[PDB]
């Protein structure tokens, strides 16, 4: 039986724009911490929330920066840990909110341990219950990505090592994370190695890609985003040119070894949705076909304001199909954006820009790579700056 524990108006500091946004938040006994634009009782409950948080295992801190009566909460949004800053008008109101959130959080821990006692099986009642000895160090790629060769099988991989401070996804155009282990001070990620280089530097050397070449890269990106959305129910969030690499044959490999990419809804502090991936596709394909970003300015205040308020100009070299695709992908309202509807990736797949493309053939790597990397071997690091 879910019930509201506390509700009221909070000022939530913007994560990218220097502002405080008034929101009506509901704290419920299941830990849900849900923010609306208006009170649900004033709009007949017919409006979706803007923010969906969970105060399970949260951390709370009261502070007087930037404003008095501020508190910071480190909580969760579905699977991601986030940090949000709130403001209220009096110290008593802040004490009520921090106490109410903490009381709900403590009640959730007791419910959890009650649930583990009820679901404990016979094996759980017993009295008691990969490593770097494998893999060979070879070279370095990032600033700390290293190139390794598995001692047992003789296969090459790229090991990402991080000091302590998308696992089961398999797709031809996604980098597969094969192994994952840790030490007392480090986290290790053994993932496949695409030695064809970053598209960021390939586009930088070519200045601009043709519409055919961009259609090749875009189609393979769409294929991977369709798999993540429909099969894994995951938003990639980080689709950008720097996270796009090529394998030895010139096919896309989305990897994970930039304020200019932020979607309008993220700049306005709404929760991420599927449509942010299609915005990111619009930005990368605009870069590929125009040789520059749709919005850019050194002053990040100007840049965010261009993204939110100004029209995208397209060069006269862009064909009408290309302009229609980019205009649809770069709609500022995610509900109007191409791919923001219920059919998601099928909206892009059926767009005239991709006419004649058999999307099963894209998955099967039957498209002709317009550029073949000249890598001599799988140890050739010529494409890593």
């Amino acid at each position: 039986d879910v019930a509201i524990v506390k509700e009221g108006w909070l000022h939530k500091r913007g994560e990218y724009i220097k502002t405080w946004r008034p929101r009506y938040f509901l704290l419920k006994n299941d830990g849900t911490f849900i923010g609306y634009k208006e009170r649900p009782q004033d709009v007949d409950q017919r409006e979706a929330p803007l923010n969906n948080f969970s105060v399970a295992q949260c951390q709370l801190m009261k502070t007087e920066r930037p404003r008095p009566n501020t508190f910071i909460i480190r909580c969760l949004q579905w699977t991601t840990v986030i940090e949000r800053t709130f403001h209220v008008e009096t110290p008593e109101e802040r004490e009520e909110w921090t106490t109410a959130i903490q009381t709900v959080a403590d009640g959730l821990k007791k419910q959890e341990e009650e649930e583990m006692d009820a679901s404990a099986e016979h094996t759980d009642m017993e009295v008691s219950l990969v490593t770097m000895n494998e893999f060979e160090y070879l070279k370095l790629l990032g600033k700390k990505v290293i190139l390794v060769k598995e001692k047992a099988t003789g296969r090459y991989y790229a090991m990402k090592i991080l000091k302590k401070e998308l696992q089961n996804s398999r797709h031809p155009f996604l980098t597969a994370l094969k192994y994952s282990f840790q030490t007392h001070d480090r986290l290790c990620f053994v993932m496949e190695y695409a030695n064809g280089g970053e598209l960021f530097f390939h586009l930088s050397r070519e200045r601009v890609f043709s519409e055919d070449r961009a259609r090749f890269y875009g189609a393979e990106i769409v294929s991977a985003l369709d798999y993540l959305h429909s099969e894994k129910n995951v938003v990639y969030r980080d689709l950008k040119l720097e996270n796009l690499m090529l394998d030895k044959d010139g096919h896309i490999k989305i990897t994970d070894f930039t304020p200019e990419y932020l979607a309008p809804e993220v700049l306005e502090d709404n929760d991420y949705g599927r449509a942010v991936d299609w915005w990111g596709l619009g930005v990368v394909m605009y870069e590929m076909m125009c040789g520059r970003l749709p919005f850019y300015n050194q002053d990040h205040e100007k840049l965010f304001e261009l993204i939110l308020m100004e029209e995208i100009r397209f060069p006269r070299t862009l064909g009408p199909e290309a302009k229609s695709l980019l205009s649809g992908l770069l709609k500022k309202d995610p509900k109007q954006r191409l791919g923001g509807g219920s059919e998601d990736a099928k909206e892009i797949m059926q767009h005239r820009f991709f006419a004649g493309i058999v999307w099963q053939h894209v998955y099967e790597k039957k498209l002709s790579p317009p550029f073949k990397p000249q890598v001599t071997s799988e140890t050739d690091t010529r494409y890593f700056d």
Partner: nanobody
Amino acid sequence: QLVESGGGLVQAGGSLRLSCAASGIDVRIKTMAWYRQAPGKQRELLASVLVSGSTNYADPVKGRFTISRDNAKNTVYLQMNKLIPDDTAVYYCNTYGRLRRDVWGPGTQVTVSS
């Protein structure tokens, strides 16, 4: 709080029934298990009963011991039949949460004499 009782001195071939009386916690909604600790051996699991009532038993007690729950009394029983001298130990009862926190009651001594 869990209180074991019902132990004592019995002869080989006799029987006993231990009781695990709970106060403050609800065994009706918790997986309950029985344990024993021999003079110089490692503490071992013997039997468990799930919330549904399904029971599982370890090898040395199969066909001899029976674990049951009394929801009305908030108590879990261990019926010990076919006792032999090797069953001599102090017997304990616990939940999962108390098990991982090493929170144990006083237990009840069972001595089976020849």
